[PDB]
Design a protein around this ligand. Structure first.
Ligand SMILES: Nc1ncnc2c1ncn2[C@@H]1O[C@H](COP(=O)(O)OP(=O)(O)OP(=O)(O)O)[C@@H](O)[C@H]1O
Ligand SMILES: Nc1ncnc2c1ncn2[C@@H]1O[C@H](COP(=O)(O)OP(=O)(O)O)[C@@H](O)[C@H]1O
Ligand SMILES: Nc1ncnc2c1ncn2[C@@H]1O[C@H](COP(=O)(O)OP(=O)(O)O)[C@@H](O)[C@H]1O
Ligand SMILES: [Mg+2]
Ligand SMILES: [Mg+2]
Ligand SMILES: [Mg+2]
Lengths: 372, 387, 151, 399
């Protein structure tokens, strides 16, 4: 075997690269852009649909729409188009040679996994492949075996507690609040300042704004009171047009939804309370240890200052006799990819691949008898 | 005596009192400055410094018209101050200090606009009460219904709000940035197709009246393309108030098509029916019938001929295509009923008039002058903590 | 996409032609036998130079229906032959000596005969139409416009 | 197999520029006018172009088939096409592919008539219709070897009958931002003729006005300062030699027209009341109505086109006005917010093929192998009927 491939088909971005490395070979938004103008420019070979970074470059005229909704793929055609683009542009290796690795959200409707493995075996001829939950990869990223992973990304967020050796499936919690919902709420509250964003390209612009100028408040009412004098919370942004945008308390109001889901009218408990309930569902033999290790991973958890509030609030909920630490790796965005690469690099993993030889006589349902 | 109610819409201004049924006075929200161009300019009576309202729209030939409100918000405020002065001082000619006024405002406006409008209403007039309400709840009041989703389409902006059993779902309020003004602009472009040019200011109101009288919403796209492609029956003759006649063809059914296909006016947002379907589908599974069972049209822009039928057919079709995935077995098990009351144009005013005496006789429900001056702009929170 | 795939055709079943006109109480075999009995009498009357009586006898009963296409075609062929085998000079007396319903059937069937000229003789049908419209009036054509589609 | 070279038609309001694909210049650039009477039958006694111009008082009455870019009379247009093809261009229609051009915002009926005339009266192998602009964007880039195509900018096509401001972003043309002013070289020519009229010059022929523009007119910053400068400076008072027909040395004393004429573009109120928005302001509105992400590309590259943009200091004045307006808006936003910005630059671009940029772009486009697949084949016309080209595509979305 030459090499191995890891492709974390996230809701918003795709991080595809060879195994055995810490730097992804190609990371780019998972957007398929189709122009909305019949006025074709004759010549110079413009193609019907645009994917990857070209979509971001030409978003001025296309209609960007993600092919994943809350971790569930719903436009398999554009999914396979994205995979085609990856394999034969950003990797330049045929899938017939190098086996791949995929990532799936926990508690995902398994029709998604079945169709995924079926379509890969059909139209990509991969020698072998595997599907693993992002939580185990996140745990493997730090090299340890204890803790509960707070993996929040673009589509959904989930917590999977795990001790040495075996996990605890009954304690897995999943919430749909994620970066897409944060961007939507930020767009909703931006119109209160007179700035209106409606198009999908405007959604990307607001997402960039959220990337650059957002943070989590240590104490919500204290910062709201501080917002009485617009001194420090007030910042500025430069639009691609050349405009100037003035942003106020919306800098920290939109990340608060992770802890107060009622802001966007979703009946639920904030991620801190979700983690507390998930750990409480575990037995006394295990939470005494799981309190100390709390793995934070994903693009959404990259917010500056979110870790401090997470820590303070989790110790507020937990008994005062507990010592709680929050793990804050400086490479949390690619943490799932690094965990997958580490898992693939181990020589003790070649045994439980999913080869075509066993797939042919077992059908697409084999993905359930092998992975989990 | 009775509290006053004001509905300062983008394209029109309506005003009245409680217990009223029809708007006491309606007039375009226009401000006319004097101007001399290549016309005959007969000296009918006189041209004053600033002419607004009915006199402005009548003498519009000799004056230029500027719209203070655009996209549901006030662009230039001095002209709008002149508008309130006109309305209070000659339209009703009753300007006491201390009376109660109930204002209106589309849902997702900027905070500054509402705040400084309330500040102007307090300081410059001295009224003893104020209340600003969404047009959607007033439209709901108009028919007396309690549960159901109401859509309001006006001159400035079209918005929809779902309400279930006296509870407003503030997180699912709609805002579609296509309205009658965009339709009028598209009509002007579609007339520029043939050769007619309307670059003056009075021509804007002329083509607005043209779209009022002639334009209609299609019910079947392919059928109307066939009609306009093979038959000349769709041709209408319209004579301008200047006295000149023009020919209008496919423009009749292509003007209000921008509401259902906003890509015609270069809008990425989904059409009216698609946006309604998404708004209803995003709600909880329990209230979905009552969202579908009671859809109430409101506003002037909803008065398009053949609009309710197209909306009902399109929402049923889109439900069939999106949920059933082409299976026609469960189609007859769907109940959708679009309300088409004759006065859905003044539903906002009717709801405001009802709310005027619904919550009267108790000043401790809204904001007073003293409370305003001693709690600043932040005092304007008793109205509603909407998102 | 969703603009096409019309649904109005199924949710509200539109009125269909049997809801407008009375249904045919007679059976297919009965009417087929009746026509197969009437036609040879008309042919024999044509043979013996009494075409007026043959047309009168053939005019007494008239078939209709969406399941009687073939027998209706044979009836129409016989009617066309009978009418074409009539001297022109005797037409006005025949037309004046008929009831309104009989004239309605005559004009209906001659007008249907006009619809297929690749197998019929149009001149005699046009001449008969001219004379009947001249004598009886326009009400016959009105009744044609308001007759059953299967007629 | 190896097809014949495509033919690049062009039917402007004032001038028609025929030619071939791959050529370095149009074969014929002659006025779009046909001479006609009112033992050769009256069916054939017609002349076009320069022959028509010379044969004006010999018994013919000239008429312009195209006005404001839209064709009104069809006999003149079809006779013009047949005379061109079978007299000057010298091609057999059945063994060539044509690339017709016509201004946007035209009725679909005009396109249908053009297609049916071409495929019935002549019945060429294939007909392709392009928008006067586009070709302008194609011809904008000079050293077009493999890669250096702008593919994003604004084309200000001002010609004889009508001017068009069309933005293009990544090739595709944004319809919703298309706006057109119904003033061009012909209207300002009528203005120049009226200015000659009021001064009671010995000769006031329209050709004299055209030549007065050809070697006299230039753009000025502002009108009152230019009037003051003309009053002070006495060497700006030229006397153009006319020699109309027999008036030898009848010099025409030109005057303030030299700067009053080009100012109509930047001040359209003078021409008529049908339009009142100055050209830089209208361009600003066009760019602002465009999607936000492509505004930088629209402002960065502005391409002039047509023969009416050859005025001296036209591009300089247009760039100055646009830059001033965009600076005003940006500074207003800055003092509203209280932060600096890098700003946006504006580069109005003029090139060596200003006069016939449309033709040059068409010739460069036709040489691409993929162009043949885009043409309307004759089989498609005979199958789908004469309405094969009625769905207007560039501006607006059908249905
Ligand atoms: N029968 C009709 N056909 C077509 N259009 C109509 C008809 N009646 C009214 N309209 C349109 O409705 C508009 C008037 O709406 P109205 O002024 O009530 O809304 P508004 O109160 O300004 O909205 P908002 O409250 O959002 O500002 C007019 O511009 C007119 O074009
Ligand atoms: N520096 C950052 N600060 C805040 N949020 C970020 C940052 N970078 C990315 N995000 C958010 O994270 C999301 C991407 O998450 P991602 O790791 O792609 O999850 P998935 O792989 O499941 O799609 C984006 O939608 C973005 O909103
Ligand atoms: N040097 C010039 N300066 C200004 N205007 C000119 C000049 N040469 C020609 N014009 C005018 O500008 C028009 C534009 O030229 P052209 O593009 O060939 O015409 P059309 O717009 O009819 O296709 C000419 O018809 C003429 O009226
Ligand atoms: Mg992930
Ligand atoms: Mg209203
Ligand atoms: Mg031109």
């Amino acid at each position: 075997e030459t090499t191995a491939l890891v492709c974390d088909n996230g809701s918003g971005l795709v991080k595809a690269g060879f195994a055995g490395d810490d730097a992804p070979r190609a990371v780019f938004p998972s957007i398929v852009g189709r122009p909305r103008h019949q006025g074709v420019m004759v010549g110079m070979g413009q193609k019907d649909s645009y994917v990857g970074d070209e979509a971001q470059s030409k978003r001025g005229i296309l209609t960007l729409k993600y092919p994943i909704e809350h971790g569930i793929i719903t436009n398999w055609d554009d999914m396979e188009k994205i995979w085609h683009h990856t394999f034969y542009n950003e990797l330049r290796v045929a899938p017939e040679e190098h086996p791949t690795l995929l990532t799936e959200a926990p508690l995902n409707p398994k029709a998604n996994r079945e169709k995924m493995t079926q379509i890969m075996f059909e139209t990509f001829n991969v020698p072998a492949m595997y599907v693993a939950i992002q939580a185990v990869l996140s745990l493997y990223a730090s090299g340890r075996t204890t803790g509960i992973v707070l993996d929040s990304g673009d589509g959904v967020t989930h917590n999977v507690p795990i001790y040495e050796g075996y996990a605890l499936p009954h304690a897995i919690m999943r919430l749909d609040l994620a970066g897409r919902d944060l961007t939507d709420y930020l767009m909703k509250i931006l119109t209160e300042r007179g700035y209106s964003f409606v198009t999908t390209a405007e959604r990307e612009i607001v997402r960039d704004i959220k990337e650059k100028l957002c943070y989590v408040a240590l104490d919500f009412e204290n910062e709201m009171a501080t917002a009485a004098s617009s001194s420090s919370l007030e910042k500025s942004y430069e639009l691609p047009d050349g405009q100037v945008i003035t942003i106020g308390n919306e800098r920290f109001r939109c990340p608060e939804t992770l802890f107060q889901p009622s802001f966007i009218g979703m009946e639920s408990a904030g991620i801190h309370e979700t983690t507390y309930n998930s750990i409480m569902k575990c037995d006394i033999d295990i939470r005494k240890d799981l309190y100390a290790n709390n793995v934070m991973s994903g693009g959404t958890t990259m917010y500056p200052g979110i870790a401090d509030r997470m820590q303070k609030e989790i110790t507020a909920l937990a008994p005062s006799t507990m010592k709680i630490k929050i793990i804050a790796p400086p490479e949390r965005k690619y943490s799932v990819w690094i965990g997958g690469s580490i898992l693939a690099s181990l020589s003790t993993f070649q045994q439980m691949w999913i080869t075509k030889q066993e797939y042919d006589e077992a059908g697409p349902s084999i993905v359930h008898r092998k992975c989990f | 005596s009775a509290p006053i109610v004001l509905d300062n819409g983008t394209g029109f201004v309506k005003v009245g009192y409680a217990k009223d049924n029809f708007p006491r006075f309606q007039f375009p929200s226009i401000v006319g400055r004097p101007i001399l161009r290549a016309e005959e300019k007969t000296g009918n009576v006189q041209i004053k410094d600033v002419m607004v309202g009915d006199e402005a729209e009548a003498v519009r030939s000799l004056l230029q018209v500027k719209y203070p409100m655009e996209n549901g918000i006030i662009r230039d405020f001095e002209e709008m101050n002149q508008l309130w002065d006109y309305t209070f001082f000659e339209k009703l000619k009753i300007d006491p200090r201390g009376r109660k006024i109930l204002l209106t405002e589309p849902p997702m406006n900027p905070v500054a606009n509402r705040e400084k409008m309330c500040e102007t209403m307090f300081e410059r007039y001295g009224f003893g009460g104020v209340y600003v309400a969404i047009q959607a709840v007033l439209s709901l009041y108009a028919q007396g219904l309690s549960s159901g989703v109401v859509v309001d389409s006006g001159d400035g902006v079209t918005h929809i709000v779902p309400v279930y059993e006296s509870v407003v779902l503030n997180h699912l309020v709609g805002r579609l940035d296509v309205a009658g003004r965009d339709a009028t602009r598209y009509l002007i472009s579609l007339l520029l197709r043939k050769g007619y040019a309307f670059n003056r200011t009075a021509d804007f109101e002329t083509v607005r009246e043209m779209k009022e009288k002639l334009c209609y919403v299609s019910y079947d796209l392919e059928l109307d393309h066939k009609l306009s492609e093979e038959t000349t029956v769709l041709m209408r003759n319209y004579t301008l108030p200047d006295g000149r006649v023009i020919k209008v063809g496919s423009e009749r059914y292509e003007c209000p098509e921008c509401l259902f296909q906003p890509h015609l006016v270069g809008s990425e947002q989904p059409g009216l029916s698609e946006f309604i379907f998404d708004t209803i589908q995003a709600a909880d599974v329990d209230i979905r019938k009552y969202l579908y069972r009671a859809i109430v049209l409101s506003g002037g822009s909803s008065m398009y001929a053949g609009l309710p039928s197209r909306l009902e057919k399109e929402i049923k079709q889109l439900w069939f295509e999106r949920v059933l995935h082409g299976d026609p077995a469960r189609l007859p098990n769907f109940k959708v009923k679009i309300e088409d009351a004759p006065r859905r144009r003044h539903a906002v005013f009717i709801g405001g008039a009802v709310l005027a005496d619904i919550m009267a006789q108790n000043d401790h429900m809204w904001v007073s002058k003293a409370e305003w001056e001693e709690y600043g702009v932040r005092a304007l929170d008793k109205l509603g903590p909407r998102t | 996409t969703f603009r096409t795939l019309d649904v109005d055709s199924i949710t509200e079943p539109v009125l269909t032609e049997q809801d407008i006109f009375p249904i045919r109480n007679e059976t297919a075999e009965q009417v087929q036998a009746a026509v197969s009995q009437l036609i040879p009498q008309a042919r024999s009357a044509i043979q013996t130079g009494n075409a007026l009586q043959g047309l009168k006898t053939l005019l007494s009963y008239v078939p209709y229906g969406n399941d009687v296409q073939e027998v209706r075609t044979q009836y129409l062929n016989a009617f066309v032959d009978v009418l074409s085998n009539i001297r022109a000079a005797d037409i006005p007396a025949f037309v004046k000596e008929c009831s309104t319903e009989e004239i309605d059937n005559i004009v209906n069937f001659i007008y249907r005969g006009l619809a297929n000229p690749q197998a019929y003789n149009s001149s005699v049908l046009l001449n008969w139409h001219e004379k009947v419209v001249e004598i009886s009036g326009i009400g016959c054509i009105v009744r044609v416009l308001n007759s059953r589609p299967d007629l | 197999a190896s097809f014949n070279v495509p033919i690049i038609m062009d039917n402007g309001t004032g001038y028609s520029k025929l030619g071939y694909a791959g050529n370095d210049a149009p074969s014929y650039v002659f006025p779009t006018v046909i001479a006609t009477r009112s033992r050769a039958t009256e069916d054939l006694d017609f002349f076009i172009g320069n022959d028509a111009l010379k044969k004006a008082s010999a018994g013919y009455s000239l008429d312009y088939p195209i006005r404001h870019g839209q064709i009104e009379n069809w006999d003149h247009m079809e006779r013009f096409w047949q005379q061109s093809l079978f007299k000057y261009l010298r091609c057999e229609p059945e063994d060539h592919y044509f690339l017709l051009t016509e201004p946007p915002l035209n009725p679909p009926e005009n396109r249908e008539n053009t297609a049916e005339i071409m495929f019935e009266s002549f019945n060429c192998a294939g007909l392709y219709i392009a928008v006067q602009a586009v070709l302008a964007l194609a011809a904008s880039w000079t050293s077009s070897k493999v890669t250096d195509r702008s593919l994003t900018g604004t084309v200000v096509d001002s010609g004889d009958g009508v001017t068009h401001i069309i933005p293009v972003a990544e090739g595709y043309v944004i319809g919703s931002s298309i706006k057109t002013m119904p003033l061009a070289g012909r209207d300002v020519t009528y203005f120049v003729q009226s200015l000659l009229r009021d001064r009671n010059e010995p000769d006031s022929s329209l050709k004299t006005a055209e030549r007065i523009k050809e070697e006299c007119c230039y753009v000025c910053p502002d009108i009152v300062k230019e009037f003051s400068r003309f009053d002070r400076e006495p060497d700006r008072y030229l006397k153009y030699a006319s020699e109309s027909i027999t008036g030898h040395s009848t010099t025409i004393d030109v005057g303030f027209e030299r700067f009053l004429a080009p100012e109509i573009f930047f001040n359209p109120e003078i021409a008529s009341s049908d339009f009142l928005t100055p050209l830089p302001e209208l361009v600003d509105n066009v760019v602002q109505s465009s999607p936000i992400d492509v505004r930088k590309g629209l402002y960065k590259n502005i391409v002039l086109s047509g023969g009416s943009t050859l005025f001296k200091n036209f591009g300089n004045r247009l760039q100055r006005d646009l830059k001033r307006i965009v600076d005003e808006r940006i500074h207003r936003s800055e003092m509203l917010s209280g932060a600096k910005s890098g700003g946006v630059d504006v580069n109005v671009i003029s090139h060596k093929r200003q006069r016939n940029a449309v033709w040059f772009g068409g010739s460069l486009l036709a040489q691409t192998p993929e162009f043949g697949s885009y043409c309307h084949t004759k089989a498609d016309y005979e199958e789908y009927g004469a309405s094969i080209a009625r769905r207007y595509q560039i501006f607006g979305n059908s249905l």
